[PDB]
Design a binder for this molecule. Sequence first.
Ligand SMILES: [Cl-]
Ligand code: NA
Lengths: 306, 305
Amino acid sequence: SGFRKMAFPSGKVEGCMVQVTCGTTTLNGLWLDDVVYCPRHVICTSEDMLNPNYEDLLIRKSNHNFLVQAGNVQLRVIGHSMQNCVLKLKVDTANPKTPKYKFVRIQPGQTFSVLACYNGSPSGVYQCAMRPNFTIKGSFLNGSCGSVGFNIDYDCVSFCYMHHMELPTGVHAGTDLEGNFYGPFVDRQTAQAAGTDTTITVNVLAWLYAAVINGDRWFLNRFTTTLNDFNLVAMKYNYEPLTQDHVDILGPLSAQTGIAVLDMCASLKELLQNGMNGRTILGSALLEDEFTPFDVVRQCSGVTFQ
Amino acid sequence: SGFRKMAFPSGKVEGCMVQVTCGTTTLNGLWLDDVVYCPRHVICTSEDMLNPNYEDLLIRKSNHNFLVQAGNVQLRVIGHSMQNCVLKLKVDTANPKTPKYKFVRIQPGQTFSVLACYNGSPSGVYQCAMRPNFTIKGSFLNGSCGSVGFNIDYDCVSFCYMHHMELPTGVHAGTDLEGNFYGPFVDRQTAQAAGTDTTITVNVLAWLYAAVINGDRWFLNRFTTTLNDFNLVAMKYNYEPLTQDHVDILGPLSAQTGIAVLDMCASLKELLQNGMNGRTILGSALLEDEFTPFDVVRQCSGVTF
Ligand SMILES: [Cl-]
Ligand code: NA
């Protein structure tokens, strides 16, 4: 029993974190096999921030202009290249702590663990979600660039996010490990702003199913809804549309609890209309949207508390 | 910027988790130096659990009755003894991944990271607080016993919790690593229950400071109060008393933000008496009490390990 924002154990990623310095700029890199990945903006200087020409900045660098430090050991850079917004530094040593890993680009609504690091050293681990507006609501200070997000289903680390910058509203933007930004953002200090965010409806429904699994039914009702009527209502509360794909993926939780997906949709409709009337759900007075259906199955019992 | 419920990096502890099996029971153990620590109830049958004599149950076990597995390697047990509610299995090999560590007993209101494990394999990490009623609001399924809680300071892991049981309300009870329970709980199947809990006032104040640091200021006001007056309000709302030591500990946050502690207490008083009026603080509609002052300073300043 219980239900917490649960991250993956971070050790497999901790063993890959290094410090990368170019000029006066230091940030974090990810050392996998004989390659260190980091944000390409490590090669910018103060004037370069608004309209950097990264190709022109990079051609002026030699391998020895990049200082890579793994704990107390300096790694020797023997090649470099840029892929989209990431720099790849080839080093002369394969990381002996490289886990089984892959790179995955995620979709809005997906969650992942973040290992926030400074100067190549881990500070802490927490769970995030890719928001519908392609930002994440992280906790990042100056020097956290190059920190990564990941999942570890089944002993293989899937790296899905590298941190690049903070937007004016205090939320965060970054890339996949191929260097492609999530959302419309660019690694320039020109004015950029997150779009209006919305609530991840499929995740709220998953969390309501988690609440039922853990023993609470107070928010259910005798009603149902069509999918289209549900979406017409939910969008009036700035909820994302629920698709048939979302209905399908909720099937297993629906089967475990005996509550049809569209019947849970009717419960959510009523919660948006009424509030909680001084109650909580899984320790929250708000509707939580950063647990996916997969996360709920990962964390909750397979036996409903009836 | 941003403020998240953040756990310590768990790598130093992951390398210490093993699987312990005795009879039909499998749970988790902590392998440090040449000793594996786990809950003593591993030796019980369900019949024994009704009313166990652990002294007598342990004399009848041999070393080979304990099957200890570190990944895919069996560790050979060469001795066994009990310390309070923890079993100590001496093994023939010192864990080469043993970090610098200490065993510490924490106080209610203090927070720590839990590494939830099953079959000796780390599964997840989250942050908890020792509640005033000496339970923790964990997330644990069958097989999680022996999972541990810890804090880190630079390179030293301070182990403070080992998981033993779930109570009927779905909260959790366990021991320090010397086998002393937190709270009035016992490792037997008898009627047990969480007591009425209270809210950790000093932590709520810390989180209000975190909110101010992150730009959430709507709850600030021109008023102040006294410790005596505020504590009469705390008692009414089932909040823990605020002591002068708590005020002293929050001093750094008061200086940084320009809001004295008793000034923030006036804000908390108003929130208790009036609610949030539909607003939120750091994305919460409840007053969060599982961040300590240290946690706020650490996260807002970027300390590493
Ligand atoms: Cl995805
Ligand atoms: Na005030």
